[PDB]
Amino acid sequence: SNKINDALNQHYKLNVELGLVYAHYAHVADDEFDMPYLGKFIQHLSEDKLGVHKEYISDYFKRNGMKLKTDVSVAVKSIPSDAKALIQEVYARENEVRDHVKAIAKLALAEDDYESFYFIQWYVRDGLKDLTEVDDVVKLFNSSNDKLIIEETIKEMVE
Amino acid sequence: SNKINDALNQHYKLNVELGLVYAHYAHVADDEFDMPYLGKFIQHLSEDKLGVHKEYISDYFKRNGMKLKTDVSVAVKSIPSDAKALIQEVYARENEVRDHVKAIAKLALAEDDYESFYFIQWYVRDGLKDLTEVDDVVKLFNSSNDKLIIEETIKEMVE
Amino acid sequence: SNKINDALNQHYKLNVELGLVYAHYAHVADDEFDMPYLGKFIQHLSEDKLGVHKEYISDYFKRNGMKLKTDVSVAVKSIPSDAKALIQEVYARENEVRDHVKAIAKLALAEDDYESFYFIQWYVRDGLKDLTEVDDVVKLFNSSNDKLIIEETIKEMVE
Amino acid sequence: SNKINDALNQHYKLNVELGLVYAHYAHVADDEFDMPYLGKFIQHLSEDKLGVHKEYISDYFKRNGMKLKTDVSVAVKSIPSDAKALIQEVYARENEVRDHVKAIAKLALAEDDYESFYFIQWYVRDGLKDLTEVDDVVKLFNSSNDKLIIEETIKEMVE
Amino acid sequence: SNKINDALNQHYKLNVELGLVYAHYAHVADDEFDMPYLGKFIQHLSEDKLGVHKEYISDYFKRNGMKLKTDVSVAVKSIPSDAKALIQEVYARENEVRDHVKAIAKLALAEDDYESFYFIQWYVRDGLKDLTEVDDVVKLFNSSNDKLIIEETIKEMVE
Amino acid sequence: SNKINDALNQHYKLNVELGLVYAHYAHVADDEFDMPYLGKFIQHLSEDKLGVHKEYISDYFKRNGMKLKTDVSVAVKSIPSDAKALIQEVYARENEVRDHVKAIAKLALAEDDYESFYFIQWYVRDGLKDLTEVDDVVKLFNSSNDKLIIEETIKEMVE
Ligand SMILES: [Cl-]
Ligand SMILES: [Cl-]
Ligand SMILES: [Cl-]
Ligand SMILES: [Cl-]
Ligand SMILES: [Cl-]
Ligand SMILES: [Cl-]
Ligand SMILES: [Fe+3]
Ligand SMILES: [Fe+3]
Ligand SMILES: [Fe+3]
Ligand SMILES: [Fe+3]
Ligand SMILES: [Fe+3]
Ligand SMILES: [Fe+3]
Ligand SMILES: [Fe+3]
Ligand SMILES: [Fe+3]
Ligand SMILES: [Fe+3]
Ligand SMILES: [Fe+3]
Ligand SMILES: [Fe+3]
Ligand SMILES: [Fe+3]
Ligand SMILES: [Fe+3]
Ligand SMILES: [Fe+3]
Ligand SMILES: [Fe+3]
Ligand SMILES: [Fe+3]
Ligand SMILES: [Fe+3]
Ligand SMILES: [Fe+3]
């Protein structure tokens, strides 16, 4: 399906662009906000998006004959003002990923593309786990007013 | 130094953009040219550029107080016509990286930035090894007319 | 070079005098400020300066024929008022060390003393790592108002 | 006791200043007198004085409430003329240490400071062992006219 | 750079020619001067110069595109008269190597050849260690009048 | 025997000069002809000639009282045009070595020098094995038109 090919190419672009934004946010968490474990948490998200998250699509295209497109444009022009806002922004972007992944599943059933429906199954499930891990971190900031206490808790999540 | 900060931000951008191009070329080597080990060779170059090659700069900025900029724009709009041309293009881009890395070293001595001169030392040395590994592969294509013989030789270089 | 010999003798004196000051500060961190892990952190800096930091120079002189001078004068006549100020003072002295080490590198190139330029390379690189470790500790004091939380974090840095 | 506090601060100063002198003598033994094992023997004495010898006092002050003073002034302005003279000078300084340590013990009993009397017990005993080890080396120079034979014997004492 | 290519070809020639001279001196140390451990010490220097010392240059040329020249002319037409003189001559030749290596470093910075500057860094550092090891042996001959005592000491340096 | 001494000194010179030529040929095999395993094969021949092949003679002289002469002159002024020609030239030089070694054996029996006859026995036997190993490689070039197939076969001979 051309429409599935386009939607998965769009998802490839999103994984790349968010990975590059997260790499920036991870640097800022450590460098500006004094939170190196928040930085490590966000760096692992960055490495996933620039790693297996994009390679699964590229490899899927190799098997079903679809075409890969590389077209990337992203600039980090402002930064959230503090660390809570930073992880809140990460969360908002991970929810956008959920919406897109669900749209792809719906479209695959529409087009009777059961290979793509089964392929996208991993994203549906795994992305919900990624979103809850991110949500847990956001909340640390409502459970403690102390940045070093929050860091200690995050340390167990990047373990 | 502002000028060193700018040049290292430019080198960060180059590592990112080439990493994304190499990821595309690795896919094409396997998918279109039937050369999965050429694909693996090019994928390892992609993973280096999107990995430690960019993280060393970002981490260096954290120590000396420089500012990181994320501004990325790259589109793969044409593909070399066969596998020799593909690895020849990779080689040409790796030589552009050599030129930039040398310009940074020269500028660091000019500015009496001995921390940056010592930091760039790794790129000078390592990039020469990366360029010779790439040059070895290009040459396989002049040593054999058989794609499966070349693949077998490449297999020992991605080992 | 006489001028390099003088500058490295001055750096030997600085390492000795700061080592003795840091030994005092480490005692005060534990004894007056109730922070024994801050004390241990500062004691390891003291042991480096009175240990390998000075022995590398002395050993370097043995190989290139330079002359060692021992002329030491230091008195600790006032103490910073609290623990944050104490580690802030440590940081200010470590930046003075960076400035001197860079001056030596510049002078070695001027004099075409490539042995000394290569010998000072370790100080340039390593001193930047020491300065960032110290800067991390200073910041704990902006990330937490609780001395026992900061101690727990420092414990992982003296590990 | 103020008088014990002063005498132990004086002993701290002596350990520091002799440690710095011994570090110089160790360098000269190797560099000028061609005796690197004599150098190693004297370096271990230097490391003791700048290490545990001074840290025991500093740590003792932490327990009994005394105050530490850092006030150091030492310059190495002449060097003994040959290696026998060098180790003979070391011996003379180690005897001065014996005299001071004994004065502290006598004063502690006078002041009914039984904690300090018991604390100084280690210095009384250990310093006698250090003085006999040094005396053994001095004598090598009366038992052999050959510097390489003496070095071989010293090698077993720095083992 | 042609001038760097020429200077490194000259350094390749020097390593070869000195290696052949040292091989002769090692034979003479054992055969004529009854000092087989002095012979072994000098043989290891010979094997370094005819081994990695020359192969590093040859391999460096392979990576940066320079041209290797083999043009060798050396004759051992006289021999130092005793063993001290023999190791003194070795020392004089190792100092000539230091001078040439430094000239290459200076020229590389002049030509903005930062690859060659970084490549020559090993020679600058390592050659200073080789020169001090050789200087230690020369001195044995001033520390003992007995050839079998000196041999025993050398035995620990060829270990 | 003076005549045996001269012939073994000539054989020492030949081993040295061929070793230096082979070192050049090994570099060219890899650098110009894209055959790094041919290069490794030729490098091992180079290391033998500059190593044990010459040290056996030098050590033999030490036992029977003969005199060693070092007089070396060799320049590589042209290179065979392709890789087959290169290994063919190596073969021709190894046959010259066979002729000289046989002349020495004949002369030793003439002079009733049974020590030299027995000493040269190793060269007679071993040099025939070296010549057949070289001949096997030459032939690869008649058994395959593909340089990467030949390389793979050579890989098992440098194993
Ligand atoms: Cl389907
Ligand atoms: Cl600097
Ligand atoms: Cl130099
Ligand atoms: Cl008491
Ligand atoms: Cl360069
Ligand atoms: Cl015989
Ligand atoms: Fe920080
Ligand atoms: Fe994951
Ligand atoms: Fe349907
Ligand atoms: Fe395929
Ligand atoms: Fe790498
Ligand atoms: Fe300058
Ligand atoms: Fe306390
Ligand atoms: Fe350190
Ligand atoms: Fe200059
Ligand atoms: Fe010495
Ligand atoms: Fe002791
Ligand atoms: Fe009493
Ligand atoms: Fe002998
Ligand atoms: Fe070496
Ligand atoms: Fe310049
Ligand atoms: Fe090549
Ligand atoms: Fe052999
Ligand atoms: Fe006969």
Side-chain angles (χ1 to χ4, degrees):
Chain A
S1 163
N2 62 112
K3 264 164 289 204
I4 293 273
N5 206 154
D6 289 350
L8 292 171
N9 269 320
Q10 283 286 312
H11 200 241
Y12 183 96
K13 175 182 161 75
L14 175 69
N15 281 306
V16 168
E17 281 167 4
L18 284 183
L20 293 170
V21 170
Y22 289 177
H24 201 282
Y25 285 4
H27 169 91
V28 166
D30 185 348
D31 188 55
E32 218 216 318
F33 302 146
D34 308 308
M35 286 189 91
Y37 283 108
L38 185 61
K40 271 159 176 146
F41 180 85
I42 303 184
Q43 184 72 241
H44 289 342
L45 296 173
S46 174
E47 280 156 359
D48 258 24
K49 284 180 159 43
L50 289 169
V52 305
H53 276 49
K54 86 179 198 305
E55 290 303 314
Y56 291 153
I57 305 178
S58 161
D59 290 352
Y60 180 56
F61 288 0
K62 285 186 207 176
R63 309 188 291 254
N64 70 348
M66 288 179 178
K67 284 304 113 184
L68 174 77
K69 176 175 142 285
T70 295
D71 183 339
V72 161
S73 147
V74 66
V76 169
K77 298 181 82 158
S78 43
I79 296 295
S81 44
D82 54 50
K84 186 194 182 195
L86 192 76
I87 194 64
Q88 269 167 340
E89 177 60 19
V90 168
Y91 184 83
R93 310 265 59 81
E94 290 291 308
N95 247 330
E96 187 203 356
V97 172
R98 236 176 118 201
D99 303 338
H100 192 204
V101 154
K102 183 221 305 147
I104 292 170
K106 180 174 184 174
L107 177 62
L109 288 183
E111 302 287 319
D112 290 307
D113 182 351
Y114 299 103
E115 298 175 344
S116 308
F117 184 75
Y118 283 131
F119 163 79
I120 204 58
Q121 171 190 96
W122 183 77
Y123 288 79
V124 186
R125 298 236 203 87
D126 170 76
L128 190 56
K129 185 262 302 141
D130 269 359
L131 185 82
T132 63
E133 252 186 9
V134 172
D135 181 58
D136 281 341
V137 173
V138 170
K139 258 76 136 138
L140 302 187
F141 292 80
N142 298 319
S143 323
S144 183
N145 56 330
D146 186 300
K147 250 147 85 146
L148 292 183
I149 296 310
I150 294 161
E151 277 280 283
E152 261 197 288
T153 302
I154 295 170
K155 198 179 155 200
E156 313 306 324
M157 308 173 167
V158 311
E159 223 304 324
Chain B
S1 163
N2 62 112
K3 264 164 289 204
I4 293 273
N5 206 154
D6 289 350
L8 292 171
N9 269 320
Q10 283 286 312
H11 200 241
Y12 183 96
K13 175 182 161 75
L14 175 69
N15 281 306
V16 168
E17 281 167 4
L18 284 183
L20 293 170
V21 170
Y22 289 177
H24 201 282
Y25 285 4
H27 169 91
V28 166
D30 185 348
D31 188 55
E32 218 216 318
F33 302 146
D34 308 308
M35 286 189 91
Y37 283 108
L38 185 61
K40 271 159 176 146
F41 180 85
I42 303 184
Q43 184 72 241
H44 289 342
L45 296 173
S46 174
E47 280 156 359
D48 258 24
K49 284 180 159 43
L50 289 169
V52 305
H53 276 49
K54 86 179 198 305
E55 290 303 314
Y56 291 153
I57 305 178
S58 161
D59 290 352
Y60 180 56
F61 288 0
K62 285 186 207 176
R63 309 188 291 254
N64 70 348
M66 288 179 178
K67 284 304 113 184
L68 174 77
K69 176 175 142 285
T70 295
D71 183 339
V72 161
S73 147
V74 66
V76 169
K77 298 181 82 158
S78 43
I79 296 295
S81 44
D82 54 50
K84 186 194 182 195
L86 192 76
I87 194 64
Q88 269 167 340
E89 177 60 19
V90 168
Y91 184 83
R93 310 265 59 81
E94 290 291 308
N95 247 330
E96 187 203 356
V97 172
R98 236 176 118 201
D99 303 338
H100 192 204
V101 154
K102 183 221 305 147
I104 292 170
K106 180 174 184 174
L107 177 62
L109 288 183
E111 302 287 319
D112 290 307
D113 182 351
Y114 299 103
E115 298 175 344
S116 308
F117 184 75
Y118 283 131
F119 163 79
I120 204 58
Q121 171 190 96
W122 183 77
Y123 288 79
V124 186
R125 298 236 203 87
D126 170 76
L128 190 56
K129 185 262 302 141
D130 269 359
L131 185 82
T132 63
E133 252 186 9
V134 172
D135 181 58
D136 281 341
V137 173
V138 170
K139 258 76 136 138
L140 302 187
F141 292 80
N142 298 319
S143 323
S144 183
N145 56 330
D146 186 300
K147 250 147 85 146
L148 292 183
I149 296 310
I150 294 161
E151 277 280 283
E152 261 197 288
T153 302
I154 295 170
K155 198 179 155 200
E156 313 306 324
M157 308 173 167
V158 311
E159 223 304 324
Chain C
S1 163
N2 62 112
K3 264 164 289 204
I4 293 273
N5 206 154
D6 289 350
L8 292 171
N9 269 320
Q10 283 286 312
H11 200 241
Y12 183 96
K13 175 182 161 75
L14 175 69
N15 281 306
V16 168
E17 281 167 4
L18 284 183
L20 293 170
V21 170
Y22 289 177
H24 201 282
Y25 285 4
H27 169 91
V28 166
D30 185 348
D31 188 55
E32 218 216 318
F33 302 146
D34 308 308
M35 286 189 91
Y37 283 108
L38 185 61
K40 271 159 176 146
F41 180 85
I42 303 184
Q43 184 72 241
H44 289 342
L45 296 173
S46 174
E47 280 156 359
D48 258 24
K49 284 180 159 43
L50 289 169
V52 305
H53 276 49
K54 86 179 198 305
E55 290 303 314
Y56 291 153
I57 305 178
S58 161
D59 290 352
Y60 180 56
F61 288 0
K62 285 186 207 176
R63 309 188 291 254
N64 70 348
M66 288 179 178
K67 284 304 113 184
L68 174 77
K69 176 175 142 285
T70 295
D71 183 339
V72 161
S73 147
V74 66
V76 169
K77 298 181 82 158
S78 43
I79 296 295
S81 44
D82 54 50
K84 186 194 182 195
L86 192 76
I87 194 64
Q88 269 167 340
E89 177 60 19
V90 168
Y91 184 83
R93 310 265 59 81
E94 290 291 308
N95 247 330
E96 187 203 356
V97 172
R98 236 176 118 201
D99 303 338
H100 192 204
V101 154
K102 183 221 305 147
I104 292 170
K106 180 174 184 174
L107 177 62
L109 288 183
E111 302 287 319
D112 290 307
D113 182 351
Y114 299 103
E115 298 175 344
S116 308
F117 184 75
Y118 283 131
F119 163 79
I120 204 58
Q121 171 190 96
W122 183 77
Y123 288 79
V124 186
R125 298 236 203 87
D126 170 76
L128 190 56
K129 185 262 302 141
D130 269 359
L131 185 82
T132 63
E133 252 186 9
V134 172
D135 181 58
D136 281 341
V137 173
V138 170
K139 258 76 136 138
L140 302 187
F141 292 80
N142 298 319
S143 323
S144 183
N145 56 330
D146 186 300
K147 250 147 85 146
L148 292 183
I149 296 310
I150 294 161
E151 277 280 283
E152 261 197 288
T153 302
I154 295 170
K155 198 179 155 200
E156 313 306 324
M157 308 173 167
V158 311
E159 223 304 324
Chain D
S1 163
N2 62 112
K3 264 164 289 204
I4 293 273
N5 206 154
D6 289 350
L8 292 171
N9 269 320
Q10 283 286 312
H11 200 241
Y12 183 96
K13 175 182 161 75
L14 175 69
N15 281 306
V16 168
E17 281 167 4
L18 284 183
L20 293 170
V21 170
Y22 289 177
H24 201 282
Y25 285 4
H27 169 91
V28 166
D30 185 348
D31 188 55
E32 218 216 318
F33 302 146
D34 308 308
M35 286 189 91
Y37 283 108
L38 185 61
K40 271 159 176 146
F41 180 85
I42 303 184
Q43 184 72 241
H44 289 342
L45 296 173
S46 174
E47 280 156 359
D48 258 24
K49 284 180 159 43
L50 289 169
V52 305
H53 276 49
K54 86 179 198 305
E55 290 303 314
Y56 291 153
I57 305 178
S58 161
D59 290 352
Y60 180 56
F61 288 0
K62 285 186 207 176
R63 309 188 291 254
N64 70 348
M66 288 179 178
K67 284 304 113 184
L68 174 77
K69 176 175 142 285
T70 295
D71 183 339
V72 161
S73 147
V74 66
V76 169
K77 298 181 82 158
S78 43
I79 296 295
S81 44
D82 54 50
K84 186 194 182 195
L86 192 76
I87 194 64
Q88 269 167 340
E89 177 60 19
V90 168
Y91 184 83
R93 310 265 59 81
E94 290 291 308
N95 247 330
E96 187 203 356
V97 172
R98 236 176 118 201
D99 303 338
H100 192 204
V101 154
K102 183 221 305 147
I104 292 170
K106 180 174 184 174
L107 177 62
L109 288 183
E111 302 287 319
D112 290 307
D113 182 351
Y114 299 103
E115 298 175 344
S116 308
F117 184 75
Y118 283 131
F119 163 79
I120 204 58
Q121 171 190 96
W122 183 77
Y123 288 79
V124 186
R125 298 236 203 87
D126 170 76
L128 190 56
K129 185 262 302 141
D130 269 359
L131 185 82
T132 63
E133 252 186 9
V134 172
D135 181 58
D136 281 341
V137 173
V138 170
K139 258 76 136 138
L140 302 187
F141 292 80
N142 298 319
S143 323
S144 183
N145 56 330
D146 186 300
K147 250 147 85 146
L148 292 183
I149 296 310
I150 294 161
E151 277 280 283
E152 261 197 288
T153 302
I154 295 170
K155 198 179 155 200
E156 313 306 324
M157 308 173 167
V158 311
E159 223 304 324
Chain E
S1 163
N2 62 112
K3 264 164 289 204
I4 293 273
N5 206 153
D6 289 350
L8 292 171
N9 269 320
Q10 283 286 312
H11 200 241
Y12 183 96
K13 175 182 161 75
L14 175 69
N15 281 306
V16 168
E17 281 167 4
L18 284 183
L20 293 170
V21 170
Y22 289 177
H24 201 282
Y25 285 4
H27 169 91
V28 166
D30 185 348
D31 188 55
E32 218 216 318
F33 302 146
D34 308 308
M35 286 189 91
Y37 283 108
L38 185 61
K40 271 159 176 146
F41 180 85
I42 303 184
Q43 184 72 241
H44 289 342
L45 296 173
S46 174
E47 280 156 359
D48 258 24
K49 284 180 159 43
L50 289 169
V52 305
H53 276 49
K54 86 179 198 305
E55 290 303 314
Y56 291 153
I57 305 178
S58 161
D59 290 352
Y60 180 56
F61 288 0
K62 285 186 207 176
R63 309 188 291 254
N64 70 348
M66 288 179 178
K67 284 304 113 184
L68 174 77
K69 176 175 142 285
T70 295
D71 183 339
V72 161
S73 147
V74 66
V76 169
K77 298 181 82 158
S78 43
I79 296 295
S81 44
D82 54 50
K84 186 194 182 195
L86 192 76
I87 194 64
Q88 269 167 340
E89 177 60 19
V90 168
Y91 184 83
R93 310 265 59 81
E94 290 291 308
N95 247 330
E96 187 203 356
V97 172
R98 236 176 118 201
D99 303 338
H100 192 204
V101 154
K102 183 221 305 147
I104 292 170
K106 180 174 184 174
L107 177 62
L109 288 183
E111 302 287 319
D112 290 307
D113 182 351
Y114 299 103
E115 298 175 344
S116 308
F117 184 75
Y118 283 131
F119 163 79
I120 204 58
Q121 171 190 96
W122 183 77
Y123 288 79
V124 186
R125 298 236 203 87
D126 170 76
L128 190 56
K129 185 262 302 141
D130 269 359
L131 185 82
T132 63
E133 252 186 9
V134 172
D135 181 58
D136 281 341
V137 173
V138 170
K139 258 76 136 138
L140 302 187
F141 292 80
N142 298 319
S143 323
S144 183
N145 56 330
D146 186 300
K147 250 147 85 146
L148 292 183
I149 296 310
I150 294 161
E151 277 280 283
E152 261 197 288
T153 302
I154 295 170
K155 198 179 155 200
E156 313 306 324
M157 308 173 167
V158 311
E159 223 304 324
Chain F
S1 163
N2 62 112
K3 264 164 289 204
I4 293 273
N5 206 154
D6 289 350
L8 292 171
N9 269 320
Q10 283 286 312
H11 200 241
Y12 183 96
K13 175 182 161 75
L14 175 69
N15 281 306
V16 168
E17 281 167 4
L18 284 183
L20 293 170
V21 170
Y22 289 177
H24 201 282
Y25 285 4
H27 169 91
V28 166
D30 185 348
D31 188 55
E32 218 216 318
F33 302 146
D34 308 308
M35 286 189 91
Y37 283 108
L38 185 61
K40 271 159 176 146
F41 180 85
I42 303 184
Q43 184 72 241
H44 289 342
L45 296 173
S46 174
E47 280 156 359
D48 258 24
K49 284 180 159 43
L50 289 169
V52 305
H53 276 49
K54 86 179 198 305
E55 290 303 314
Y56 291 153
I57 305 178
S58 161
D59 290 352
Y60 180 56
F61 288 0
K62 285 186 207 176
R63 309 188 291 254
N64 70 348
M66 288 179 178
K67 284 304 113 184
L68 174 77
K69 176 175 142 285
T70 295
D71 183 339
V72 161
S73 147
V74 66
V76 169
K77 298 181 82 158
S78 43
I79 296 295
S81 44
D82 54 50
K84 186 194 182 195
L86 192 76
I87 194 64
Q88 269 167 340
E89 177 60 19
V90 168
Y91 184 83
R93 310 265 59 81
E94 290 291 308
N95 247 330
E96 187 203 356
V97 172
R98 236 176 118 201
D99 303 338
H100 192 204
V101 154
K102 183 221 305 147
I104 292 170
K106 180 174 184 174
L107 177 62
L109 288 183
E111 302 287 319
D112 290 307
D113 182 351
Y114 299 103
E115 298 175 344
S116 308
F117 184 75
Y118 283 131
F119 163 79
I120 204 58
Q121 171 190 96
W122 183 77
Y123 288 79
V124 186
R125 298 236 203 87
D126 170 76
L128 190 56
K129 185 262 302 141
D130 269 359
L131 185 82
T132 63
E133 252 186 9
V134 172
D135 181 58
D136 281 341
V137 173
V138 170
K139 258 76 136 138
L140 302 187
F141 292 80
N142 298 319
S143 323
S144 183
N145 56 330
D146 186 300
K147 250 147 85 146
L148 292 183
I149 296 310
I150 294 161
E151 277 280 283
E152 261 197 288
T153 302
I154 295 170
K155 198 179 155 200
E156 313 306 324
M157 308 173 167
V158 311
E159 223 304 324

mmCIF file of all heavy atoms in Angstrom, chain D residues 112-115, ligand 4:
data_model
loop_
_atom_site.group_PDB
_atom_site.id
_atom_site.type_symbol
_atom_site.label_atom_id
_atom_site.label_comp_id
_atom_site.label_asym_id
_atom_site.label_seq_id
_atom_site.Cartn_x
_atom_site.Cartn_y
_atom_site.Cartn_z
ATOM 1 N N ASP D 112 48.557 15.601 82.581
ATOM 2 C CA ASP D 112 47.556 14.570 82.847
ATOM 3 C C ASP D 112 46.648 14.356 81.641
ATOM 4 O O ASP D 112 45.449 14.097 81.775
ATOM 5 C CB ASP D 112 46.735 14.902 84.096
ATOM 6 C CG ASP D 112 47.546 14.781 85.373
ATOM 7 O OD1 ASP D 112 48.158 13.711 85.587
ATOM 8 O OD2 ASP D 112 47.578 15.752 86.157
ATOM 9 N N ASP D 113 47.227 14.469 80.443
ATOM 10 C CA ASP D 113 46.507 14.201 79.198
ATOM 11 C C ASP D 113 46.827 12.770 78.756
ATOM 12 O O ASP D 113 47.712 12.514 77.940
ATOM 13 C CB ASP D 113 46.881 15.237 78.148
ATOM 14 C CG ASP D 113 46.131 15.053 76.836
ATOM 15 O OD1 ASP D 113 45.431 14.030 76.653
ATOM 16 O OD2 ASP D 113 46.255 15.945 75.970
ATOM 17 N N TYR D 114 46.075 11.818 79.300
ATOM 18 C CA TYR D 114 46.407 10.423 79.042
ATOM 19 C C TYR D 114 45.982 9.979 77.645
ATOM 20 O O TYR D 114 46.662 9.140 77.039
ATOM 21 C CB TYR D 114 45.828 9.551 80.158
ATOM 22 C CG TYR D 114 46.432 9.943 81.498
ATOM 23 C CD1 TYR D 114 45.719 10.713 82.415
ATOM 24 C CD2 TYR D 114 47.744 9.582 81.823
ATOM 25 C CE1 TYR D 114 46.279 11.092 83.627
ATOM 26 C CE2 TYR D 114 48.312 9.959 83.027
ATOM 27 C CZ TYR D 114 47.575 10.712 83.928
ATOM 28 O OH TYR D 114 48.139 11.081 85.133
ATOM 29 N N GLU D 115 44.937 10.587 77.078
ATOM 30 C CA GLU D 115 44.638 10.390 75.658
ATOM 31 C C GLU D 115 45.825 10.763 74.755
ATOM 32 O O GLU D 115 46.172 10.010 73.838
ATOM 33 C CB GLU D 115 43.400 11.199 75.273
ATOM 34 C CG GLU D 115 42.117 10.813 76.008
ATOM 35 C CD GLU D 115 40.942 11.732 75.669
ATOM 36 O OE1 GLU D 115 41.165 12.840 75.120
ATOM 37 O OE2 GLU D 115 39.790 11.335 75.939
HETATM 38 CL CL CL G 4 42.961 12.003 79.404
#
